[PDB]
Design an enzyme around this catalytic site. Structure first.
Site, PDB file in Angstrom:
ATOM      1  N   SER A 159       0.850  -1.199   0.000  1.00  0.00           N
ATOM      2  CA  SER A 159       0.000   0.000   0.000  1.00  0.00           C
ATOM      3  C   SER A 159       0.884   1.246   0.000  1.00  0.00           C
ATOM      4  CB  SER A 159      -0.971  -0.135   1.170  1.00  0.00           C
ATOM      5  OG  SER A 159      -2.070   0.756   1.031  1.00  0.00           O
ATOM      6  N   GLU A 204      -9.533  -4.818  -3.824  1.00  0.00           N
ATOM      7  CA  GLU A 204      -8.816  -3.702  -3.220  1.00  0.00           C
ATOM      8  C   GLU A 204      -9.747  -2.626  -2.661  1.00  0.00           C
ATOM      9  OE1 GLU A 204      -5.859  -3.545  -2.609  1.00  0.00           O
ATOM     10  OE2 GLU A 204      -4.721  -4.801  -3.985  1.00  0.00           O
ATOM     11  N   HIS A 261      -8.059  -5.365   0.626  1.00  0.00           N
ATOM     12  CA  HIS A 261      -6.797  -4.654   0.718  1.00  0.00           C
ATOM     13  C   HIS A 261      -6.058  -4.984   2.005  1.00  0.00           C
ATOM     14  CE1 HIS A 261      -4.090  -1.281  -0.144  1.00  0.00           C
ATOM     15  NE2 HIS A 261      -4.234  -0.900   1.113  1.00  0.00           N
TER      16      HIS A 261
END
Ligand SMILES: O=[N+](O)c1ccc(N2CC[NH+](CCN(C[C@H]3CCC[N@@H+](Cc4ccccc4)C3)S(=O)(=O)c3ccc4ccccc4c3)CC2)c2nonc12
Ligand SMILES: *[C@@H]1O[C@H](CO[C@@H]2O[C@@H](C)[C@@H](O)[C@@H](O)[C@@H]2O)[C@@H](O[C@@H]2O[C@H](CO)[C@@H](O)[C@H](O)[C@H]2NC(C)=O)[C@H](O)[C@H]1NC(C)=O
Ligand SMILES: *[C@@H]1O[C@H](CO[C@@H]2O[C@@H](C)[C@@H](O)[C@@H](O)[C@@H]2O)[C@@H](O[C@@H]2O[C@H](CO)[C@@H](O)[C@H](O)[C@H]2NC(C)=O)[C@H](O)[C@H]1NC(C)=O
Ligand SMILES: *[C@@H]1O[C@H](CO[C@@H]2O[C@@H](C)[C@@H](O)[C@@H](O)[C@@H]2O)[C@@H](O)[C@H](O)[C@H]1NC(C)=O
Ligand SMILES: *[C@@H]1O[C@H](CO)[C@@H](O)[C@H](O)[C@H]1NC(C)=O
Ligand SMILES: *[C@@H]1O[C@H](CO)[C@@H](O)[C@H](O)[C@H]1NC(C)=O
Ligand SMILES: *[C@@H]1O[C@H](CO)[C@@H](O)[C@H](O)[C@H]1NC(C)=O
Length: 526
Positions: free
Chosen positions: A195, A322, A435
């Site tokens: 990320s 995500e 995510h």
């Protein structure tokens, strides 16, 4: 169990893992603490010490706002800091195999958190399984986040910007100067992060002062060309001065604003960080990387496009869902507690939340591309559409374009598509492969059968760990001995990628081809 570094001796501790031993050194400092005069400055080298530093517990996390949107819920609280917040937080951790290896490949972990949150001490970042199973040395570091790490007045060394990126970079240098003493090979250092940590790893590929500090890079669900990763230098200055008024620190001597902000209490800066932007989204990066002229000399997109980066192998990837995680932080009709079936008008409401500064026509162009259906009255049509929008715009399509662009300068690149929903995943099932929930597989947590994962998850985590380890040591993410799918190189033309699931592993081509031509070619114009 004491090691002599360049700034003095440090004591660690040993740990039992899978009937073997790993040695942990938690909380080695790597810079003079950035308090008082040093707040907002680049990190300064660390003065010698003659005692024995005790690196037996995680150090303080950096100051940061906590996610209090689902108090008590493990799904969000597993990401919240688990050690004291403090401005004294520039420390790192090292897990070395026992017995001490002699020339071990080094994996350096950089956590995500949108450049406003995160800490190296999270349970899913425990590097002990990797050290035991693949006999690599694992390093993670804390770095300043939010305004404390990214407040920007260009050129002014009082708040130059990118300080958190420089904390990362000084950790890398520490590994260069010192990791030989722990049995590691400074010539074989792989950076990996997820990320905002992935976006950081990609920015180290661009920053000349980092060229010589690492060998290879792994980018999980993130890269610097994502729309949330870098902010223009003028938008950065608008934000630091909007924070200045919000704390009543306004002056015309830019330097005098800084020393005014240097007397305010960290909690006061933290609670005003949110409002320096006109309209926020659940993806806002209030204070983050900027073109500072020092760590980063040009818009990263120019540098990527024109081949100006460290030439090396990369491993890049994304998860199937995500975007879903962000839908329950502000999208109407969404909740983790029902299955969040929304309507066409709720969908359109969601677009105004995630694309607030975007034209009416822009938002209809999004609606038009994502809402002509293979069947019009699937009741979850609009719920799935909104998740895909957020994930494709913010993660999947930037990571695909980064990889395309990077590989066409001649380097080997590998792309994965992670699509196993964890059996321990606390969010509802309509959120899918969320995510950040590949991280536990990368760190080998399912290798511990004492703790709730299916056997099939143990096996999938075992090969991921092997492929990652083989990529770090040899530049090639194959699992060779167990008759595995061969991971093809991702070429600019055919764009093969590998799927990662518990059933079995497939080679596919051109992930999200239609969606990405929308996002990466149409939408930037609107
Ligand atoms: C309107 N709201 C909503 C709340 N938040 C405040 C704090 N944030 C963090 C929250 C929101 C986001 C991510 N989950 C963690 C998470 C939750 C569930 C699963 C996996 C991870 C918590 S964040 O630290 O600002 C930030 C973080 C990650 C990012 C990733 C990409 C781009 C930007 C990001 C920003 C803004 C104001
Ligand atoms: C650049 O900054 C100006 C000044 O900011 C604002 O004040 C802060 C304290 C905070 O309250 C922000 O939310 C404000 O936006 C911004 O100007 C303003 O526009 C907003 C709405 O668009 C409005 O509420 C304010 O009255 C305006 N302020 C002034 C001084 O006119 C501006 O939006 C920022 N953005 C850009 C891109 O320059
Ligand atoms: C799914 O839930 C959302 C909201 O989660 C809820 O919030 C409360 C309304 C309460 O009922 C909690 O137990 C829920 O889990 C619903 O959104 C609400 O819908 C009403 C309609 O009158 C609206 O006024 C609220 O603003 C909505 N809440 C929001 C946007 O946060 C939604 O309708 C539920 N849908 C389904 C299919 O269950
Ligand atoms: C550092 O720690 C010394 C104690 O040694 C050990 O530390 C941990 C692992 C405990 O399990 C303890 O029982 C061990 O004996 C101290 O003697 C020393 O003073 C400490 N130094 C500082 C600066 O705190
Ligand atoms: C570690 O490997 C490098 C080459 O990768 C070599 O130059 C170095 O001398 C080695 N150090 C050892 C074996 O201690
Ligand atoms: C005021 O600004 C000038 C530059 O314009 C700078 O040299 C000076 O140091 C600032 N004042 C203080 C007290 O630092
Ligand atoms: C290969 O398969 C065996 C089971 O036959 C398993 O125990 C081992 O850990 C596997 N190795 C890798 C790298 O997955």
């Amino acid at each position: 169990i004491i090691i002599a570094t360049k700034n003095g001796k440090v004591r660690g501790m040993q740990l039992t893992v899978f009937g073997g031993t790993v040695t942990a050194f938690l909380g080695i400092p790597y810079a003079q603490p950035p308090l008082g005069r040093l707040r907002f400055k680049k990190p300064q080298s660390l003065t010698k010490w003659s005692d024995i530093w005790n690196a037996t517990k995680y150090a303080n996390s950096c100051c940061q706002n906590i996610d209090q949107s689902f108090p008590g819920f493990h799904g969000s609280e597993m990401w919240n800091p688990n050690t004291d917040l403090s401005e004294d937080c520039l420390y790192l951790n090292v897990w070395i195999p026992a017995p001490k290896p002699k020339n071990a490949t080094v994996l350096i972990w950089i956590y995500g958190g949108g450049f406003q949150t995160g800490t190296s001490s999270l349970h899913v970042y425990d590097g002990k399984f990797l050290a035991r199973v693949e006999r690599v040395i694992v390093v993670s570091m804390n770095y300043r986040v939010g305004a404390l790490g990214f407040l920007a007045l260009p050129g002014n060394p009082e708040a130059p910007g990118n300080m958190g990126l420089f904390d990362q970079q000084l950790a890398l240098q520490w590994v260069q100067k010192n990791i030989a003493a722990f049995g590691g090979n400074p010539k074989s250092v792989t950076l990996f992060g997820e990320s905002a940590g992935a976006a950081s790893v990609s920015l180290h590929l661009l920053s000349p002062g980092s060229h010589s500090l690492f060998t290879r890079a792994i980018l999980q669900s993130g890269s610097f060309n994502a729309p949330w990763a870098v902010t223009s230098l003028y938008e950065a200055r608008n934000r630091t001065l909007n924070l200045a008024k919000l704390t009543g620190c306004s002056r015309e001597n830019e330097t005098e604003i800084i020393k005014c902000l240097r007397n305010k209490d960290p909690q006061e800066i933290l609670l005003n960080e949110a409002f320096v932007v006109p309209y926020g989204t659940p993806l806002s990066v209030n204070f983050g990387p900027t073109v500072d002229g020092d760590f980063l000399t040009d818009m990263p997109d120019i540098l990527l496009e024109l081949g100006q980066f460290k030439k090396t192998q990369i491993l890049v990837g994304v998860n199937k869902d995500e975007g879903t995680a962000f839908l329950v932080y502000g999208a109407p009709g969404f909740s983790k507690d029902n299955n969040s079936i929304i309507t066409r008008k709720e969908f359109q409401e969601g677009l105004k939340i995630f694309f607030p500064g975007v034209s009416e026509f822009g938002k209809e162009s999004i609606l038009f591309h994502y809402t002509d259906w293979v069947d019009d009255q699937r009741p979850e049509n609009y719920r799935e559409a909104l998740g895909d929008v957020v994930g494709d715009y913010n993660f999947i399509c930037p990571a695909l374009e980064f990889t395309k662009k990077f590989s066409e300068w001649g380097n080997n690149a590998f792309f994965y598509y992670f699509e196993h929903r964890s059996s321990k995943l606390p969010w509802p099932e309509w959120m899918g492969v969320m995510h950040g929930y590949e991280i536990e597989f990368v760190f080998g947590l399912p290798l511990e059968r004492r703790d709730q994962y299916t056997k099939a998850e143990e096996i999938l985590s075992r090969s991921i760990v092997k492929r990652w380890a083989n990529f770090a040591k040899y530049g090639n993410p194959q699992e060779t001995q167990n008759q595995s799918t061969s991971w093809p190189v991702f070429k600019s033309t055919e764009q093969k990628y590998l799927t990662l699931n518990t059933e079995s592993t497939r080679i596919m081509t051109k992930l999200r081809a239609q969606q990405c031509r929308f996002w990466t070619s149409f939408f930037p114009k609107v």
